[PDB]
Amino acid sequence: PQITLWKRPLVTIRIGGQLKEALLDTGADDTVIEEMNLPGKWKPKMIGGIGGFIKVRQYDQIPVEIAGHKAIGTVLVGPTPVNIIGRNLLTQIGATLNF
Amino acid sequence: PQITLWKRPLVTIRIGGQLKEALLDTGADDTVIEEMNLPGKWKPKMIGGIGGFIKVRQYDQIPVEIAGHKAIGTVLVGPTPVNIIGRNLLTQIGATLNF
Ligand SMILES: CC[C@H](C)[C@@H]1NC(=O)[C@@H](NC[C@@H](O)[C@H](Cc2ccccc2)NC(=O)OC(C)(C)C)Cc2ccc(cc2)OCCCNC1=O
């Protein structure tokens, strides 16, 4: 689809067999999801954004369906205000910025 | 133009007479520029991102040219590692997400 920016670009995603709302964030290198139980092994990791660094659990090669489009990649789970779909998954579904 | 997301979508902006590199961020409600001495009246405010909140100064009606596209709106100045162009200015240059 073509998504305008008058509102936050929120879409539904399916991850771990569960549906959630996530923000398509081109300013995010990675995908950060709110705390949840995800099947698979995880490595502790630290990432930083505007207000600082947080600790996250890194899950690799996790299938994520974004608006019906499939991606299989790394997702970080940790304390976040909102589910963020970053560049690592946006590139898999062929998302581009246009103006 | 069409910007792919293989790399951070960084473009040149012009603000306050200066040229800077800034990240096009669809996940940002506001525009945050790195600490600069912009003249004008400002109001204090706190914005949060991943990790927490930072104090910034809010300037209104600031002319910003993005990739040769003119826009004008609120710009927050504060200690950010990178300049961030948020939706408040992206909508003005007709930017859309497409996949
Ligand atoms: C500072 C930008 C803007 C103010 C802020 N947006 C944001 O910070 C959104 N984009 C994240 C991007 O703005 C930053 C840019 C950056 C890059 C490198 C170093 C530092 C910062 N990237 C970023 O945080 O990448 C992570 C998620 C992988 C850690 C993600 C988000 C959305 C809503 C959030 C919290 C976070 O909570 C909602 C509150 C509204 N906050 C916002 O809209």
Distinct small molecules bound, one entry per kind: the ligand CC[C@H](C)[C@@H]1NC(=O)[C@@H](NC[C@@H](O)[C@H](Cc2ccccc2)NC(=O)OC(C)(C)C)Cc2ccc(cc2)OCCCNC1=O
Architecture per CATH nomenclature, i.e. the level-2 architecture of chain A: Beta Barrel
Q: Give the tally of structural domains of chain A.
A: 1
CATH superfamily (homologous) name of chain A: Acid Proteases
For the terminal residues of chain A, how far apart are their CA atoms? 15 Å
Determine the fraction of residues in helical runs of chain A and give it as a percent range: under 10%
Question: In the CATH scheme, what's the topology name of chain A?
Answer: Cathepsin D, subunit A, domain 1
Q: What does this protein look like?
A:
Two copies of one chain form a homodimer. With 99 residues, chain A is mainly beta. The first copy, chain A, contains one helix and nine strands, in the order ββββββββαβ. In chain A, 4% of the residues lie in helices and 55% in strands. The first copy, chain A, has one domain (1-99): Cathepsin D, subunit A, domain 1. At the A-B interface, β1, β5, β6 and β9 of A face β1, β5, β6 and β9 of B. β9 of chain A pairs antiparallel with β9 (96-98) of chain B, so a sheet runs across the interface. The complex binds the ligand CC[C@H](C)[C@@H]1NC(=O)[C@@H](NC[C@@H](O)[C@H](Cc2ccccc2)NC(=O)OC(C)(C)C)Cc2ccc(cc2)OCCCNC1=O. The PDB classes it as hydrolase/hydrolase inhibitor. Keywords: aspartyl proteinase, aids, aspartyl protease, HYDROLASE-HYDROLASE INHIBITOR complex. The assembly is dimeric. The entry is titled "HIV-1 protease complexed with a cyclic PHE-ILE-VAL peptidomimetic inhibitor".
